């Protein structure tokens, strides 16, 4: 008898993290000089993510992959003829997709009506579990209510999340209260073979203008 | 009132994964130009590895780190004067150590070979795997003891990088032995653990060969 020999691609597999569960991931393929029937297996602590068909070698995903929980891990693959089991190790390299969206931290301040233009009224933070460009956050005011008095222009958000006064206020001739709606969006990434900007759920900031006559 | 300002190093910390739990990790340091009293905090899904004292800023490790779970992560730090709270994101970069050792999936194996098996022919195969990656994750196999340790015994077998045990000699159920027990061991090529080059090894595993008389 000659030991079944694994092919030369069974040392590592690259699998993306968006891969659906029950998806055909790869095939355990080996060759025997004697043509004995071959039975395939996977073992060890991280073999829960996979599901080998013990006669064909079809492996399909049985647990989710996350780059933000296990970016790479090792598994024990096995080919066995009627006389010998050959066990060998495979490195699984998982690929990052933009799977996570900016999440806001805490939203109400109270600023004086005499505040100068450019003054920082408030600051917001939002974090994306993703790293690199798919983690980078862009801040947006989606609606100021009331819309009276160029409200759409009285406030500007920057990149730090500082909200800066782009205008003048008047407790008596504009409004005593603005509600700003804020979004957070990642600079972008790949999800499902397709460039995906993942955005957050609009949060609301309640500014109260203070009358100092 | 001017808002507290973090120092410019509070944007990221490089932490080794051998850092024991309850160890000073780093300090949250900020500066108020009004010199107000400062109260620090850590927030977010990944602040369970950390224990911040609110008034000092001392951060200690509350949960073990691992480069083989989470090699980099983010956490919300916070500084608050009596009047305003500043939150900011911090990036934790974890560094690999030789923390993991080669592990056999079974500690006891057992086989049967025929005395007429030619020299060079593969008897058995073993695998040991290190969760560690790189040179710290490379298993070197060794035969540490033959029992029966007769002269010939210590030269009749040889383990290879693949884990294949090969015949380096000839056998005899009658004129030699009808059993050889071999102690094996799997050692990594080496790496850094507690600021010292560490070679992490496995536990003695025993392969029981049985010779078959083919007269
Ligand atoms: C290493 O390479 C081997 C050999 O190329 C890969 O096995 C092959 O994988 C392909 C694609 O996954 C298989 O194709 C599929 O075949 C099924 C069955 O007929 C068919 O229904 C599908 O539509 C698809 O065509 C192919 O069967 C398989 N080749 C052999 C000889 O079995 C394997 O994916 C690679 N493994 C690793 C670890 O990267
Ligand atoms: C950012 O930089 C600051 C300032 O360089 C770092 O804070 C300082 O951290 C060191 C240790 O890294 C502290 O030293 C220790 O002091 C205590 C007594 O408080 C002593 O028991 C220890 O033996 C050690 O000497 C130091 O206190 C601290 N400095 C201040 C002004 O608090 C900080 O670690 C850095 N943060 C990051 C994210 O790297
Ligand atoms: Ca064969
Ligand atoms: Ca991701
Ligand atoms: Ca994202
Ligand atoms: Ca202050
Ligand atoms: Ca390690
Ligand atoms: Ca190791
Ligand atoms: Cl394993
Ligand atoms: Cl072991
Ligand atoms: Na994910
Ligand atoms: Na580790």
Author numbering:
A (entry chain B): 1 to 106, 109 to 215
B (entry chain A): 1 to 215
Which lines from the publication concern this structure?
Enterocytes are specialized epithelial cells lining the luminal surface of the small intestine that build densely packed arrays of microvilli known as brush borders. These microvilli drive nutrient absorption and are arranged in a hexagonal pattern maintained by intermicrovillar links formed by 2 nonclassical members of the cadherin superfamily of calcium-dependent cell adhesion proteins: protocadherin-24 (PCDH24, also known as CDHR2) and the mucin-like protocadherin (CDHR5).
As expected, all EC repeats in all 3 PCDH24 structures adopt the typical 7 β-strand Greek-key fold seen in extracellular domains of cadherin proteins, with β-strands labeled A to G for each repeat. The crystallographic packings observed for the hs and mm PCDH24 structures show various interfaces that further highlight differences across species. Remarkably, there are 2 sets of potential antiparallel trans dimers. To probe the most promising trans interface observed in our human PCDH24 structures and to understand the different modes of adhesion observed in our bead aggregation assays, we introduced mutations into hs PCDH24 EC1-2Fc and EC1-3Fc fragments and tested their adhesive properties. Unexpectedly, bead aggregation experiments using hs PCDH24 EC1-2Fc p.Y67A and hs PCDH24 EC1-3Fc p.Y67A showed larger calcium-dependent aggregates than when using the wild-type protein fragments. In contrast, bead aggregation experiments using hs PCDH24 EC1-2Fc p.Y71A did not show aggregation with results similar to EDTA controls, while the size of the aggregates mediated by hs PCDH24 EC1-3Fc p.Y71A were markedly reduced when compared to those mediated by the wild-type protein. The tyrosine residue in the human protein (p.Y71), important for trans homophilic adhesion as suggested by our structure and bead aggregation assays, is not conserved, and it is switched to a smaller proline (p.P71) in the mouse protein.
